[PDB]
Write a protein that binds this ligand. Structure first.
Ligand SMILES: [Cl-]
Ligand SMILES: [Zn+2]
Ligand SMILES: [Zn+2]
Length: 391
């Protein structure tokens, strides 16, 4: 059989545990949670990267649904609760295809039943409003990982796409990591600055993750992971879940985006300006300079290097589907995973290597978080420290 056929066979036994899908945010923005207007039990290819049929075709066996909310707007806690509610509604609306999962055991139970284990991950520390009790509430509601920052710094952690702030994690930031360790919530280092990554690794007593980040050595961009950080994963026991975002993984895309941003500023616009005037300027740029397109090979290049530095037991996949408008050819939506697995097979990756990449590493890491939590919960009570006290 072909590598693609083999890939599908392998995925049927050990499916993909995707680390980060922003479907909830897409539903919030596109139809304000009017789920009937974007019923994932139907074909949503015209509007979204995600729907049930494509998840099945893609071999996805577990999904960490992101409950991301904007950090530049007030009411982040309320919005996060609405995002969590959206995930719960999706699970309740499609019991035949989805199963809520809070533990590693739940993930295996879902796999045995043929249902997609549905977990939740908060994206950005602003979701807890500098409140440790709020962090605990999110865990109680089912959140199993929290990206310490999104694109902007928060009061206690520095983002990779912002200027230096506290220098990584502040004293309160370390307290947040300690509490996440006690609760059993995975510390997610995607989006954070390299300084923050190192501070988190120094502090965490549990394996950490990168729900959607690739290799900085392969493609120099702050959203990717430096080799020195990848090297620490074996000792920490965590894992880096490679992402597909073109402007992060393809060198030509990183350069193109930088030039596009410069062009925007050349016209007196902030590179993030979305006004009709700004859009006209950007359209003109893309007209004379076509947008580079990434491929499955691009992503495989990252995984090859990540495997070399971090080790096969410390890798995963986090597509960032419905969180980014652009995708690599061959990975246009959630049905594309088999193409990546096929490419890796062609590159010599073994069946066991791939089972770790797709399923086993993720289950091991969540189980580890639970194990560390058992020890810490029995050793001490929860923290009631405030950011004022520590910072
Ligand atoms: Cl992202
Ligand atoms: Zn993200
Ligand atoms: Zn996201």
């Amino acid at each position: 059989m072909t590598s693609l056929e083999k890939a599908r066979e392998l995925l049927r036994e050990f499916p993909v545990v995707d680390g980060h899908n922003d479907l909830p945010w897409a539903l919030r923005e596109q139809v304000r949670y009017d789920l009937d207007a974007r019923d994932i039990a139907a074909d949503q290819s015209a509007h979204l990267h995600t729907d049930l049929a494509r998840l099945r075709s893609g071999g996805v066996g577990a999904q960490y649904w992101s409950v991301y909310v904007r950090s530049d707007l007030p009411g982040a806690v309320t919005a996060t609760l609405e995002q969590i509610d959206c995930v719960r509604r999706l699970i309740d609306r499609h019991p035949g295809e989805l199963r809520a999962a809070l533990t590693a055991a739940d993930m295996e139970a879902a796999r045995a039943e043929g249902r997609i284990a549905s977990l939740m991950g908060a994206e950005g520390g602003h979701s807890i409003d500098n409140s440790l009790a709020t962090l605990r509430a999110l865990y109680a509601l089912g959140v199993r990982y929290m990206t310490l920052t999104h694109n902007d710094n928060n009061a206690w952690a520095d983002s990779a796409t912002d200027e230096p702030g506290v220098g990584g994690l502040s004293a309160f930031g370390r307290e947040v990591v300690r509490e996440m360790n006690r609760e059993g919530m995975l510390v997610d280092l995607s989006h954070v600055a390299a300084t923050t990554m190192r501070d988190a690794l120094d502090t965490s007593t549990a394996p950490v993750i990168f729900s959607h980040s690739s290799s900085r050595a392969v493609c120099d961009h702050p959203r990717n992971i430096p080799d020195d950080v990848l090297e620490r994963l074996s000792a920490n026991g965590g894992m880096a879940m490679v992402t597909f975002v073109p402007k992060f993984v393809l060198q030509a895309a990183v350069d193109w985006t930088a030039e596009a941003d410069d062009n925007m500023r050349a016209h007196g616009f902030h590179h993030l300006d979305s006004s009709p005037e700004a859009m006209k300027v950007h359209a003109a740029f893309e007209e004379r300079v076509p947008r580079p397109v990434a491929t499955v090979s691009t992503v495989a290049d990252h995984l090859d290097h990540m495997r070399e530095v971090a080790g096969v037991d410390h890798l995963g996949i986090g597509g960032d589907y419905d969180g980014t408008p652009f995708t690599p050819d061959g990975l246009g939506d959630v049905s594309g995973y088999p193409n990546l697995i096929a490419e890796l097979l062609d590159r010599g990756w073994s069946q066991s290597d791939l089972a770790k990449l797709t399923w086993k590493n993720a289950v091991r890491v969540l189980d580890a978080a639970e194990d560390v939590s058992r020890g810490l919960r029995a050793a001490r009570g929860p923290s009631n420290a405030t950011i004022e006290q520590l910072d």
